[PDB]
């Protein structure tokens, strides 16, 4: 039956990338297992509500398939010494021998394993660093509650060489625009990808060099593929409706403020220590300075003034400290640009790199690749 031999690094890397997309549960006999397939290399497959496949090179003595515990296998491969790993299926058990170590793992029925879907045609590919940065940027604002599945996804809009990623939990909206290498026309499509799976595939070892998305061509149904470095994961697209986020963005701001990201983040962390159940932090904007305040007289009062480059009438606005720091961290820039209309309307956070620039009257919203729009709290 199945017998193969390969290095520990490649085996543990494949099993690791597949195991990073598998959530959990013990038994669950079939769904908690991982499939090892010798062919002519080695394929490691898993499925939950998203599939993960990792193809690596290996010496196949005899081909076949086998099903073993995913969590157990990932633990073994992670904790093994770096030596050639020998896997040999004996009857209903798997013999894994690496160096001085010998493991006998029981098996699960292979006949009950589902056939994994084939990834669609390649829509395009983009560098892995840009993919991880963008998905990590927009994913932070997605909804975590499956009761409203329209908010649990990331809106992916592809117009030709340009890709737009948007997600919102109703309290914050993160939009990131980027350029990629498209193999289609003129590729015009829009899909809603579940945020958790896309974020997991992004934060993992998918590359390698470039990440390839599979839809594939001209819209598409029903799945989105992610491919690279011999690793393939596919997610089923959400059939829900994403709100129109291009209309929710304000055209012009009444007041704009540019600050230092790190200074502001540390200030928020410091003042929020007295906040009531971490409710809100108050920002009082004046000429040249903003004043962060939080807490009440029963617990304690915190106040800090920060240097600001400010324009427009003074205004007082409050935010959720965790949401604001989430946006500031997701900007991945040295400075932040704050749009403000009123204290009940959202604020626009845009990245500012290190150096940049009407008076009284209003100011337009500059076009930046990433934007974090945050709703305020009542004063």
């Amino acid at each position: 039956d199945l017998t193969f031999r390969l290095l520990r690094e490649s085996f543990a890397d494949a099993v690791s990338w597949v195991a990073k997309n598998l959530p959990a549960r013990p038994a669950v006999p079939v769904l908690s297992g991982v499939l090892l397939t010798g062919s002519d290399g080695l394929t490691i497959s898993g499925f939950d509500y998203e599939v993960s496949e990792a193809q690596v090179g290996a010496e196949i003595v005899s081909p076949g398939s086998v099903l073993v515990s995913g969590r157990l296998l990932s633990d073994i491969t992670r904790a093994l010494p770096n030596k050639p790993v020998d896997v040999h299926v004996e009857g209903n058990r798997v013999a894994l021998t690496c160096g001085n170590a010998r493991f006998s793992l029981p098996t699960m029925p292979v006949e009950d394993y589902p056939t994994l879907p084939t990834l669609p045609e390649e829509t395009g590919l983009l560098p892995a660093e840009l993919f991880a940065e963008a998905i990590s940027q927009v994913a932070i604002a997605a909804g975590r509650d499956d009761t409203l599945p329209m908010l649990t996804g990331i809106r992916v809009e592809i117009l030709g060489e340009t890709v737009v990623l948007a997600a919102t939990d109703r309290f914050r909206l993160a939009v990131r625009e980027l350029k990629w290498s498209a193999s289609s026309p003129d590729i015009e499509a829009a899909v809603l990808v579940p945020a958790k799976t896309l974020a997991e595939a992004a934060k993992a070892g998918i590359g390698g060099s470039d990440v390839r998305l599979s839809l594939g061509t001209g819209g598409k149904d029903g799945l989105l593929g992610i491919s690279g470095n011999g690793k393939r994961s596919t997610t089923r697209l959400l059939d829900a409706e994403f709100p129109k986020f291009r209309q929710l963005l304000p055209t012009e701001h009444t007041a704009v403020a540019t600050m230092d990201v790190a200074e502001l983040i540390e200030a928020i962390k410091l003042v929020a220590l007295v906040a009531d159940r971490g409710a809100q932090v108050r920002m009082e904007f004046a000429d040249g300075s903003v004043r962060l305040s939080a807490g009440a007289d029963d617990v304690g009062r915190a106040e800090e003034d920060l240097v600001v480059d400010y324009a427009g009438e003074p205004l007082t606005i409050a935010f959720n400290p965790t949401y604001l720091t989430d946006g500031l961290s997701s900007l991945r820039s040295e400075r932040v640009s704050f749009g403000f209309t009123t204290a009940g309307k959202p604020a626009l956070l845009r990245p500012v790199s290190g150096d940049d620039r009407n008076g009284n009257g209003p100011f337009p919203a500059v076009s930046t690749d990433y934007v974090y729009l945050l709703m305020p709290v009542r004063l």
Binding site: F171, P243, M375
Partner: peptide, 5 residues
């Protein structure tokens, strides 16, 4: 906390 929509 206000809502976007």
């Amino acid at each position: 906390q206000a809502d976007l929509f």
